[PDB]
Design an enzyme around this catalytic site. Sequence first.
Site, PDB file in Angstrom:
ATOM      1  N   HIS A  61      20.126 -37.492  -2.864  1.00 10.12           N
ATOM      2  CA  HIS A  61      21.510 -36.715  -2.209  1.00 10.12           C
ATOM      3  C   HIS A  61      22.691 -37.606  -2.576  1.00 10.12           C
ATOM      4  O   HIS A  61      22.612 -39.067  -2.847  1.00 10.12           O
ATOM      5  CB  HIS A  61      21.363 -36.764  -0.754  1.00 10.12           C
ATOM      6  CG  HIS A  61      21.168 -37.861   0.080  1.00 10.12           C
ATOM      7  ND1 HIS A  61      20.307 -38.722   0.077  1.00 10.12           N
ATOM      8  CD2 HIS A  61      22.176 -38.504   0.813  1.00 10.12           C
ATOM      9  CE1 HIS A  61      20.392 -39.777   1.062  1.00 10.12           C
ATOM     10  NE2 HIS A  61      21.372 -39.681   1.408  1.00 10.12           N
ATOM     11  N   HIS A  63      26.557 -38.824  -0.445  1.00  7.29           N
ATOM     12  CA  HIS A  63      27.043 -38.786   1.003  1.00  7.29           C
ATOM     13  C   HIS A  63      28.565 -39.375   0.702  1.00  7.29           C
ATOM     14  O   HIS A  63      28.885 -40.182   0.061  1.00  7.29           O
ATOM     15  CB  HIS A  63      26.377 -39.850   1.922  1.00  7.29           C
ATOM     16  CG  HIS A  63      26.803 -39.487   3.215  1.00  7.29           C
ATOM     17  ND1 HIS A  63      28.235 -39.574   3.823  1.00  7.29           N
ATOM     18  CD2 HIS A  63      26.127 -39.894   4.576  1.00  7.29           C
ATOM     19  CE1 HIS A  63      28.226 -39.407   4.997  1.00  7.29           C
ATOM     20  NE2 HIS A  63      26.945 -39.576   5.394  1.00  7.29           N
ATOM     21  N   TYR A 124      52.751 -37.844  19.398  1.00 13.61           N
ATOM     22  CA  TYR A 124      53.047 -36.588  18.715  1.00 13.61           C
ATOM     23  C   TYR A 124      54.096 -35.673  19.360  1.00 13.61           C
ATOM     24  O   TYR A 124      55.182 -35.320  19.007  1.00 13.61           O
ATOM     25  CB  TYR A 124      51.806 -35.945  18.333  1.00 13.61           C
ATOM     26  CG  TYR A 124      52.136 -34.523  17.596  1.00 13.61           C
ATOM     27  CD1 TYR A 124      52.702 -34.218  16.380  1.00 13.61           C
ATOM     28  CD2 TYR A 124      52.025 -33.242  18.342  1.00 13.61           C
ATOM     29  CE1 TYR A 124      52.936 -33.163  15.657  1.00 13.61           C
ATOM     30  CE2 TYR A 124      52.467 -32.068  17.903  1.00 13.61           C
ATOM     31  CZ  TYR A 124      52.978 -31.975  16.569  1.00 13.61           C
ATOM     32  OH  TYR A 124      53.425 -30.785  15.819  1.00 13.61           O
ATOM     33  N   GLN A 128      58.642 -34.938  19.152  1.00 12.74           N
ATOM     34  CA  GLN A 128      59.068 -33.523  18.745  1.00 12.74           C
ATOM     35  C   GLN A 128      60.373 -33.587  19.203  1.00 12.74           C
ATOM     36  O   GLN A 128      60.855 -34.086  20.241  1.00 12.74           O
ATOM     37  CB  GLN A 128      58.258 -32.382  19.676  1.00 12.74           C
ATOM     38  CG  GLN A 128      57.055 -32.392  19.049  1.00 12.74           C
ATOM     39  CD  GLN A 128      56.870 -32.215  17.367  1.00 12.74           C
ATOM     40  OE1 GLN A 128      57.481 -31.476  16.832  1.00 12.74           O
ATOM     41  NE2 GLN A 128      56.005 -33.206  16.654  1.00 12.74           N
TER      42      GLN A 128
END
Lengths: 152, 152
Positions: A61, A63, A124, A128
């Site tokens: 595998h 990852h 955040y 604004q």
Amino acid sequence: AVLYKSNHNVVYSCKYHIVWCPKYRRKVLVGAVEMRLKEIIQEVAKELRVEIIEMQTDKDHIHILADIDPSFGVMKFIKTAKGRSSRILRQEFNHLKTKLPTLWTNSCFISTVGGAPLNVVKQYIENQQNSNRPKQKEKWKSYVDNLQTKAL
Amino acid sequence: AVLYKSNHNVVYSCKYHIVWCPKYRRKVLVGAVEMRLKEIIQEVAKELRVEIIEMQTDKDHIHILADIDPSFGVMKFIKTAKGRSSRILRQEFNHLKTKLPTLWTNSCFISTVGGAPLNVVKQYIENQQNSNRPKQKEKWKSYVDNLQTKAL
DNA sequence: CCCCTAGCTTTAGCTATGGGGA
DNA sequence: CCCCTAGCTTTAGCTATGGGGA
């Protein structure tokens, strides 16, 4: 870095853990194959603007820990990474072509990784604009301008 | 629940924190508007098979904790959520239509959430078939059948 | 869940919130 | 960053790994 900005106004951090295995979970991801696989995935990421944070393989595998623009879509990066690597690797090493019907399967594992934003979310909102006044435009510019991006 | 499966063979858990604010960061997400806003987002989530784990507004922004099929795309849920709520809300409440040019902005915040997979990844790999023998097809069918989905 | 077709790259070999169904 | 255009839904009002640029 950790917090990116859309080519437009999308503020994001989208890290994904991706894991998929070879056909029959065959242990072909070693030596020459493992090396080329990682190289090919690297080219795809730069091309698709995907940030490979971490990436290791372990025989049956691979990852990957990646950062992906939410507008783009995780499955587009996987589609390409699996599709191409399969074509190339089967072309480069014949036992991957003669012994398996395909390189990969139609499966894959995906999980979002990240912790409570808390403060990042507060910063955040706070930044604004609350009007079109000069100060506000300056507050916002300064905020987004100080964010990471994905060119190329 | 936490670990889902695609209509096909994608094993996933993609959780996202989503936040967007009204135009001008106007504190209008209260009272009637807030209630109707949540109701609308609830309908869009079910229509788009998006799982709303948590949702809460707070005057000048809505905060959503959603789980979305990786093959669907975060922005399609946000596009419809913002798009529709705006059309309806501005239709149901005029102070939202006369005092603002739009309900929302072209911005939004998105962050992936969840911790390391570790054991979940080991189980994912261990249950991939290593051949077409019946026992492998049972091991696999058993595994995926014991996973959550998103019908409707 | 499987297999079939569309769609698009890698034009082979992968995904499509794809589709239909003993 | 902005504004313009196209795409698609909500056919208004949103996004586009959109585009171009004093």
